[PDB]
Fold this sequence. Notes:
The structure is a homodimer.
Chain A: H1 12-20, E1 23-27, E2 32-35, E3 42-48, E4 51-56, E5 62-68, E6 73-74, E7 90-93, E8 97-103, H2 104-113, H3 115-141, H4 144-159, E9 163-164, H5 168-175, H6 179-191, E10 195-198, E11 201-204, H7 207-215
Antiparallel strand pairs in A: 1-8, 2-7, 3-6, 3-8, 4-5, 4-7, 9-11, 10-11
Amino acid sequence: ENYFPLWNDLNTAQKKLISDNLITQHVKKGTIIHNGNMDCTGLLLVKSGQLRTYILSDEGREITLYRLFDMDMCLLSASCIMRSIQFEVTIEAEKDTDLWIIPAEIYKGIMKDSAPVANYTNELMATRFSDVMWLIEQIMWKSLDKRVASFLLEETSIEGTNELKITHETIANHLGSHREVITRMLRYFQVEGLVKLSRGKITILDSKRLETLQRS
Amino acid sequence: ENYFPLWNDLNTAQKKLISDNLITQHVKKGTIIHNGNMDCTGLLLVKSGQLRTYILSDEGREITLYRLFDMDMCLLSASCIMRSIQFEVTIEAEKDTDLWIIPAEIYKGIMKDSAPVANYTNELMATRFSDVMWLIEQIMWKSLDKRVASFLLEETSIEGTNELKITHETIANHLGSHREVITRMLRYFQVEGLVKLSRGKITILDSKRLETLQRS
Lengths: 216, 216
């Protein structure tokens, strides 16, 4: 109600239909909430937490498309309400997350009759389209050292700490790389004094220098 | 009118506003019709021809996002009508093209009041979002030899001939590669009997074998 900006634009009938069909859900970290064509739960409003939209190759390789934080809305968890979305994505909780779910059939129904809700969904798609376009630009134009540097700066901002407790597999899965290549890269960073590597931990030593890689 | 599927869904007032403001335009090949934030002409309905949506790095490197053919609609040529589209694209004519342009201000106005036109624009975005998602999947999971093989099979289908009259630069610009890497790859293909290379021409010799690379 406070976290849904379309609320002031909705009428009484629309406000009531969504309100009376809101599903509250606490999702623990590591839970897959949407898994391509298998699920079509609905739009997710993140009250508090962190979600990760990604794609999987048939060989189990992964790359993160984008992340959703507190107050974001997930549209692709209700992908089946749009025939023209002909790609599948996996959405999972990176931290314990409190969500509200607006059922797909309900949201689809309101969207059919409301230009405001229809246009709002366009703006939501355009944002995610733009997120994915920044990703193509990053993948094509920036080398792996710069992308690892960029990721380490993002995670430290999200966690509010220069001490990351993640595996080399998770970094590889974020960037569309292999663990061995990430490990090689982190060891090059350690030799260059950018990070410190220890048991289940990457400590960012020079945040100023990592930012100059990202920018290079 | 025949090429615009939303026409039957429009009312008299909407049909008249679009009809009386249609701009007919013959565009010669090599003409840039949209160049990021510089232009915001409108939605383009391709009566007959071929358009190419691509992105440019600050160093002049290119990769094709998707192609539009006869009967397709271009949405991103009117990107400024959606605040949430925060990426720029270049659109140009690959062959001489006959277009109709629906001015952006006019289309935006109809979209504000019509759920049908609003939802139709979503489906148009979703299609292009899906095109770009196939591209991420191709870039990440398929090696350059497979992507070159895939492109050669596409161009031969479009041109209706196993004889392509294109430069190594154009192929590099389609795939996000460098000319020298494409030339190296085409020479490997020639050594393997897949193609024949001669003055300003690539002749596909084994279309069956190129398809088995694409699929690998």
